[PDB]
Design a protein around this nucleic acid. Structure first.
Length: 98
DNA sequence: TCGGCCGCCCTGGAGAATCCCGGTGCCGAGGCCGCTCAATTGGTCGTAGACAGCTCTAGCACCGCTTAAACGCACGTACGCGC
């Protein structure tokens, strides 16, 4: 999109609200109750953008393409700390691949 | 990204003009009257036209050549028409 404003301008900066409230909702250190998070974005973002997000969320994104399980070209970055979230995509008979 | 601009259908609402409907008034048309002159009737002549007869002119019909032109097909570019 030629008119794009990046990550710190326009509607790009709306992620930081989520980042804040996620941090506020996260248990404090020493409180070992289970807690999990998942954030999504488009693969086609700026390299400096992706880097800044990777620095802020203290993780590298997993790239997952929808087409393997969802028959759509929607390649998306997924930040999060779900266990075993690196594992390859499996297909289920219920899901539609065509 | 993403919010602000031109057809399309659908629809009808103000709105200036027009049709319909009454109310009034007037002057032009329908009807009555005298009268007088043009339509009618009767008769008579005179010739325009109806009709018989003849004739003889041209109009229709036919036929055979003879090319002059009408027809038919290709074709291509100039003009009719839509935008």
């Amino acid at each position: 999109n030629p008119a794009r404003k990046g990550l710190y301008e326009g509607t790009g900066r709306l992620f930081f609200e989520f980042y804040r409230l996620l941090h506020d909702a996260r248990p404090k250190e020493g409180d070992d109750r289970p807690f999990f998070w998942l954030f999504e974005n488009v693969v086609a973002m700026g390299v400096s953008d992706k880097r800044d997000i990777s620095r802020f969320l203290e993780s590298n994104p997993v790239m997952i393409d929808a087409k393997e399980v969802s028959a759509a070209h929607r390649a998306r970055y997924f930040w999060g700390n779900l266990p075993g979230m690196n594992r390859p995509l499996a297909s289920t008979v219920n899901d539609k691949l065509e």
